[PDB]
Design a protein around this ligand. Structure first.
Ligand SMILES: CC(C)=CCC/C(C)=C\CC/C(C)=C/CC/C(C)=C\CC/C(C)=C/CC/C(C)=C/CC/C(C)=C/CC/C(C)=C/CC/C(C)=C/CC1=C(C)C(=O)c2ccccc2C1=O
Ligand code: SF4
Ligand code: SF4
Ligand code: SF4
Lengths: 220, 406, 165, 191, 183, 38, 125
């Protein structure tokens, strides 16, 4: 790692997702990289949090567990390597200096262009005792969408691992019962995946109809 | 074992808000196991957001957790602004109005919670008095925004429009009357023997339970922990307001109800402070590259873009016309990145994970709605008690299912 | 000790206060001046339609509740100042969410939102309001929309507000 | 008066009316017993409820409010208690009781039926039984010329009961409890 | 019922008019509500307005006593079976008011999760725009439903009305063919 | 401790409490349906 | 043989025309002749179903005042020995509801003549 994480490659001026309306403007190639690894002097209490996490975790264990550290908009994200998630979560919750007792949930986000890391689970953690907060990010490939479930560490992640599963298919291995919570159990597909179509219908008008927004042209 | 029924509180039930499905194993009439069934109000708002621009998904987010529209809007707009790095550029008047509207909305949401809880617990007139107060609050909201619910008034970088000239007077009248009229509602419930017997000691949940389930809002603060995202992790300039975090130590339904009742008065105090600090000025960022170009004004033909703005864009300013056209059609472009922004909605920490891929549409917008997490406490606060106690416990959780399902 | 009975004193008291209900429909209550009522297509003082059919209102609609089709203002039949006018304009009020983004989108103020709200039908199609149902009534001094622009006036004059009946 | 109060509480209980309203309990059991009933079967259940309200209000009027006798402002009027006026007075008293029903419904939430049974057995029944004794002893003493003693006992008795019931309302229903112990969930630090 | 066996003379006409007057009044809504439209329905019941003036304050907790089903909010896929069950568990005559854009056509939520109008699963009698419709709009739609209920036929008149309505409906073109002035 | 147990599965044609929920592997989750139910 | 009677329900006359075009007088020469009863309103469709004598009902899930899926559920709950029901769905995601309606088959819009014919043959066979 240590390089910028490109989630999508945007080519052509004006955010055209296809050939483009005006000729000659489609040759730009701008990769869409999320913020990369932050230089070590993190801001505010992030430095203390990371130093404590690296002290509690062995240097080898820390290097194996923490895949990346990002400080964006004065918010700390820790790209935690899959598999090692339960260990670092336990350390964060239990370590007196960290004491991130309040896990606010799990959010799924799909990056279909992020090879080997399509599905990200975001764990916003807050320490009331220290009035701190951080986010963990766990990436998983579309091929093996498995993440260690934090049910033992953060029971609140229950239903969240379910919602995130229901909407993305992340399997959260070890969850007591990873059953669809929003969509019906007979439902096919995971709606919030980018490949899942919006599933709208045309809007009816006198003599015309407007297709759903996902079918019509857009610029990003 | 074979002597206990299993019943559906079901979506269609007066206390289940029409879409919540409590599945209760009752041994006689004691709840033995309490499964929670969700998704009957799933709406695809989170996915449908992805096909609309910024300043447009506002109209979507205001409709999840529809009892706290301004809170959803404020969380969304704070996320967008933080992604833009604009949070420090928002006009002071816009932030003050945001705080004022969030606190009035807190009063309104608590009023709905008290109304529906009293109705569920038989307090018939509680619903009517709570909605009588909420009617004045919604009159103010309608005058400010032109809508009674699902307002899209708070926009990325400020507000949709400035306050009408009469708005300040109406809000001052609210500050004057809300305590007196809330006195009527408190008299019906606060010290009522039946109300206390019906809620005191019911739906108990210790601080350990709140942490384990990640509960927040009045449920958590009924445990005595003064956790409030307004004091801890301040936003929208809440740090400039003198108010006390309401917290109780009963850890039960009545404690949560009292917390809401006192939060109404704290919100009244914060609104008085907002009026004191409200000063004339812009309500949208000065950066024309991001500022919402619309300038709504009233006339004999109704509400529409002000004739001065029409003159500027269609008559003299080519740059103005281009900016209006683009900011209205495609909208702003938000630099790529992730941001988790949290506010203290009436029901707890309303969090928003917002991911932008550099485009004109939100790449991903997830609401950690406090009701979704709080409903995980139904098993703790219902198992062991009677179904009558389960009703009170669920009402105390005050779940708005729009936020639950989204 | 009487505090526990305070609620009684409330209700009984209210039983002697005048009910606060608005008298709708006989005496409808006062809506906010800024309320987001039915969209309305407005005209210039001379009767020309303001809508140039730019589709910005439809563009900004989150619910795809507006359908607009522009057409040329040929000299034989002119409906709005300038080159374009919206000849087809439909609002699907079963998709409208009253957000008001459309009016904020309009560059001509051709679209406003009135305070009128009474609207409902037993038929889905009947709630797709066309241009005829949305156009503001032809006021005094106005003329039929298919007529030439005011003498010695141009589109810029209309937008600058320098036109009269 | 103690008999009147116990009877009134039992009236509201008998008619399945708020704040008892238990069998229906709309907010709890949807429709309660009359769920699965529609049309005139439900109509007849509600008719029976209202006729019971009227019957028991009229019984209260008969037993405690002097039945059809004219009230004091009209009692002095000649012929008020004779002719068809007694019908007017009886209807007025019955409708005051109906107003009490409606007022209770508007003001009070509904009890849990366990709480209602606790009210019946720990308060109503003991109070009524103590009152039955007190009244018997009082009347026996008065019949034997004891006089003052009765006037004392009665008052003392009520003075005790209103206190003892107050205890059940305030002392037995203690409003304090100890804090809970922490567990594996790593609780935060309380204020 | 025997009221549907009555001969089509003045007797049937008077039974129809009295039944319509009786049913337009006392039109108990079902205690049912999905989303913010439910909040506006409660506000309509609230003091500022008064649904009660129209004899409609008794929100029947059970569908058996309910006469009108104000959908009052968005209907998700998983909820449509429940809403249909509630509709079927009401006893005729029944009416469905699609309150709000979500209930009537899916509104802004044109996606997989929303049914795109409750008429997909239950016969809708009145569509009510708004998001949410303000309480006056709900009362307007309710009065429109009252007018519809008043003119509701019975018996042989009901059969003739059904046949005539069918004949009229078979001829109307679809909305997609009303190309008036479309280029 | 088993945070509120998974709700009974909701299927087209079946949403009663007796219906087990579907695990990702397609198997019925035992915890979804109360043990007493057949 | 007995002309198989098919009920075609749709507020849209063009959907009825397409359904009748996919299924001719005979779906196949081996099958009996087909007679079509067109119904535009749900009350008429329900009354026709109550009258009975139908071998198949094609119900448009997109019907305006009363959707085809709702009518399918109603008829399978209200008519004893009701004929097989075929539902036309306006979108792919409606499939779940099509399953809920207990319709024997579901054909998405736009109506593919061949897919509709094959489904009808399967239901009548
Ligand atoms: C046989 C014969 C004909 C004889 C001849 C004589 C003759 C004619 C008859 C004799 C007399 C008889 C028998 C007459 C018949 C009538 C009769 C017996 C009685 C019926 C009438 C009656 C009982 C009247 C009084 C009833 C009464 C007190 C009604 C008031 C009820 C109230 C207060 C209703 C308001 C409820 C309300 C606020 C409704 C909203 C419901 C909602 C919104 C549901 C959904 C929902 C909910 C539930 C939330 O709380 C919620 C909270 C937060 C977010 C979302 C939601 C949400 O989605
Ligand atoms: S109504 Fe306004 S925004 Fe819409 S096409 Fe006409 S001028 Fe353009
Ligand atoms: S109010 Fe909003 S949803 Fe309705 S037509 Fe205007 S822009 Fe579209
Ligand atoms: S129509 Fe609007 S107010 Fe009603 S449920 Fe849908 S989004 Fe909510």
């Amino acid at each position: 790692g240590d390089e910028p994480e490109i989630i999508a490659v945007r080519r052509g001026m004006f955010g055209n997702r296809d050939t483009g309306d005006t000729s000659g403007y489609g040759r730009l190639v701008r990769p869409v990289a999320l913020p990369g690894s932050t230089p070590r002097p993190y801001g505010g209490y992030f430095d203390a949090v990371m130093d404590r996490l690296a002290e509690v975790l062995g240097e080898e264990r820390y290097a194996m567990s923490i895949e990346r550290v990002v400080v964006y908009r004065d918010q700390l994200t820790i790209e935690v390597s899959r598999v090692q998630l339960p260990a670092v979560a336990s350390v964060l919750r239990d370590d007196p200096d960290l004491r991130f007792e309040l896990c606010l949930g799990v959010s799924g986000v799909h990056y279909p262009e992020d090879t080997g890391r399509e599905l990200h689970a975001v764990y916003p953690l807050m320490s009331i005792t220290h009035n701190r907060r951080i986010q963990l990010e766990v990436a998983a490939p579309d091929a093996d969408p498995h993440i260690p479930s934090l049910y033992a560490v953060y029971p609140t992640t229950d239903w969240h691992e379910r919602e995130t599963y229901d909407f993305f298919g992340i399997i959260f291995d070890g969850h007591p019962s990873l059953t669809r919570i929003e969509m019906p159990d007979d439902w096919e597909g995971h709606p919030q995946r980018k490949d899942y179509p919006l599933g709208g219908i045309p809007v009816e008008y006198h003599g015309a109809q407007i297709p759903p927004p996902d079918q019509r042209r857009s610029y990003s | 074992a074979g002597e206990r029924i299993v019943v559906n509180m079901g979506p269609q039930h007066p206390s289940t808000h029409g879409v919540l499905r409590l599945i209760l194993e009752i041994e006689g009439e004691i709840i033995t196991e309490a499964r929670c069934g969700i998704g009957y109000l799933h709406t695809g708002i989170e996915k449908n957001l992805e096909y609309r621009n910024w300043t447009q998904g506002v109209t979507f987010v205001t409709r999840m957790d529809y009892l706290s529209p301004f809170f959803n809007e404020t969380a969304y707009c704070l996320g967008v602004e933080k992604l833009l790095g604009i949070t420090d550029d928002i006009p002071e008047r816009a932030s003050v109005i945001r705080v004022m509207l969030m606190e009035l909305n807190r009063i309104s949401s608590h009023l709905v919670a008290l109304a529906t809880g009293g109705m569920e617990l038989g307090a018939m007139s509680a619903m009517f008095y709570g909605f009588r107060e909420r009617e004045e609050i919604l009159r103010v909201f309608e005058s400010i925004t032109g809508l009674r619910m699902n307002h899209a008034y708070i926009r990325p970088g400020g507000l949709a429009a400035d306050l009408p000239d009469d708005a300040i007077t109406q809000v001052r009248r609210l500050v004057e009357i809300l305590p007196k009229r809330l006195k009527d509602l408190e008299d019906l419930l606060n010290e009522n023997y039946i109300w206390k017997a019906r809620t005191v000691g019911v739906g108990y949940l210790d601080l350990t339970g709140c942490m384990a389930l990640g509960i927040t809002g009045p449920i958590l603060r009924s445990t005595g922990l003064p956790h409030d995202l307004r004091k801890a992790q301040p936003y929208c300039g809440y740090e400039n307001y003198e108010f006390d975090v309401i917290t109780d130590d009963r850890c039960d339904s009545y404690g949560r109800y009292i917390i809401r009742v006192k939060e109404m008065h704290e919100s009244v105090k914060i609104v008085e402070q907002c009026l004191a600090r409200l000063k004339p000025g812009p309500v949208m960022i000065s950066d024309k590259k991001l500022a919402w170009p619309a300038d709504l004004k009233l006339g004999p033909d109704g509400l529409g873009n002000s004739p001065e703005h029409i003159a500027k864009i269609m008559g003299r300013s080519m740059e103005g016309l281009i900016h209006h056209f683009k900011l209205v059609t495609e909208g702003i472009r938000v630099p790529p990145g992730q941001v988790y922004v949290a506010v203290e909605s009436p029901r707890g920490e309303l969090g928003v994970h917002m991911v932008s891929d550099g485009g004109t549409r939100p790449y991903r917008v997830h609401y950690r709605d406090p009701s979704f997490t709080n409903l995980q406490a139904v098993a703790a606060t219902c198992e062991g008690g009677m179904v009558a106690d389960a009703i009170a416990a669920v009402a105390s959780i005050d779940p708005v299912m729009g936020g639950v399902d989204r | 000790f009487l505090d526990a009975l305070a609620g009684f004193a409330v209700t009984l008291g209210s039983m002697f206060k005048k009910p606060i209900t608005e008298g709708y429909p006989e005496k409808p209550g006062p809506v906010a001046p800024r309320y987001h009522g039915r969209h309305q297509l407005n005209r210039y003082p001379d009767g020309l339609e303001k809508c140039i059919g730019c589709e910005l209102c439809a563009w900004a609609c989150p619910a795809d509740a507006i359908y607009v089709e522009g057409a040329d203002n040929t000299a034989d039949e002119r409906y709005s100042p300038g080159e374009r006018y919206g000849r087809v304009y439909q609002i699907n009020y079963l998709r409208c969410i009253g957000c008001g983004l459309c009016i904020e989108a309009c560059p001509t103020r051709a679209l406003t939102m009135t305070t009128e709200y009474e609207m409902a039908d037993d038929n889905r199609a009947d709630l797709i309001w066309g241009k005829d149902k949305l156009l503001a009534p032809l006021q005094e001094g106005m003329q039929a929309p298919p007529h030439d622009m005011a003498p010695g006036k141009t589109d810029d004059d209309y937008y600058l507000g320098n036109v009269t009946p | 008066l103690p008999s009147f109060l116990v009877y009134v509480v039992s009236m509201v209980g008998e008619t399945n009316r708020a704040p008892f309203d238990l069998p229906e309990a709309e907010g709890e059991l949807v429709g309660g017993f009359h769920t699965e009933y529609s049309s005139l079967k439900f109509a007849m259940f509600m008719l029976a409820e209202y006729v019971n309200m009227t019957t028991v209000s009229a019984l209260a009027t008969t037993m405690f409010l002097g039945g059809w006798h004219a009230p004091f402002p009209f009692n002095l009027i000649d012929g008020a208690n004779s002719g068809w006026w007694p019908l007017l007075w009886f209807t007025a008293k019955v409708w005051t009781f109906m107003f009490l029903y409606f007022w209770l419904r508007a003001t009070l939430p509904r009890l849990r039926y366990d709480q209602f049974m606790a009210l019946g057995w720990k308060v109503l029944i003991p109070v009524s039984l103590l009152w039955i004794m007190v009244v018997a002893i009082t009347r026996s003493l008065r019949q034997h010329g004891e006089g003052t003693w009765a006037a004392w006992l009665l008052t003392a008795a009520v003075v005790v009961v209103v206190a003892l019931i107050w205890g059940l309302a305030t002392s037995l229903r203690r409003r304090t409890v100890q804090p809970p112990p922490p567990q594996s969930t790593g609780a935060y630090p309380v204020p | 019922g025997l009221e549907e066996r009555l001969p089509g003379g003045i007797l049937l006409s008077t039974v129809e008019t009295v039944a319509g007057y009786v049913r337009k009044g006392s039109l108990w809504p079902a205690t049912f509500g999905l989303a913010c439209c439910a909040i506006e329905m409660m506000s309509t019941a609230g003091p500022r307005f008064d649904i009660a003036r129209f004899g409609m304050e008794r929100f029947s907790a059970t569908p058996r006593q309910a006469d009108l089903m104000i959908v009052a909010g968005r209907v998700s896929q998983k909820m449509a079976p429940v809403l249909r069950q509630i509709y079927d568990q009401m006893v005729e005559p029944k009416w469905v008011l699609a309150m709000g854009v979500c209930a009537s056509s899916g509104g802004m939520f044109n996606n997989y999760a929303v049914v795109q109008g409750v008429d997909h699963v239950v016969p809708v009698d009145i569509y009510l725009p708004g998001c949410p419709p303000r309480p006056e709009m709900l009362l307007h739609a309710i009065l429109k439903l009252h007018d519809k209920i008043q003119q509701m036929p019975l018996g042989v008149n009901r059969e003739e009305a059904i046949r005539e309505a069918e004949q009229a409906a078979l001829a109307v073109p679809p909305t997609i063919e009303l190309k008036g002035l479309l280029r | 401790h088993p945070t509120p147990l998974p709700n009974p599965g909701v299927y087209a044609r079946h949403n009663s409490v007796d219906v087990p929920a579907r695990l990702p592997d397609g198997s019925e989750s035992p915890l979804s349906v109360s043990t007493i139910l057949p | 043989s007995a002309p198989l009677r098919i009920l075609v329900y749709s507020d849209n006359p063009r959907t009825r025309e397409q359904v009748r075009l996919a299924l001719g007088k005979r779906i196949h020469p081996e099958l009996p002749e087909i007679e079509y009863v067109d119904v535009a309103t749900a009350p008429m469709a329900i009354s026709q179903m109550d009258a009975g004598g139908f071998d198949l009902a094609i119900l448009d899930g997109e019907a305006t005042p009363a959707g085809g899926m709702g009518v399918a559920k109603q008829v399978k709950d209200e008519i004893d020995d009701c004929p097989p029901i075929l539902v036309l769905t306006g979108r792919a995601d409606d499939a779940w509801l099509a399953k809920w309606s207990r319709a024997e088959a579901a054909v998405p819009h736009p109506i593919d003549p061949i897919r509709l014919s094959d489904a009808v043959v399967s239901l009548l066979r």
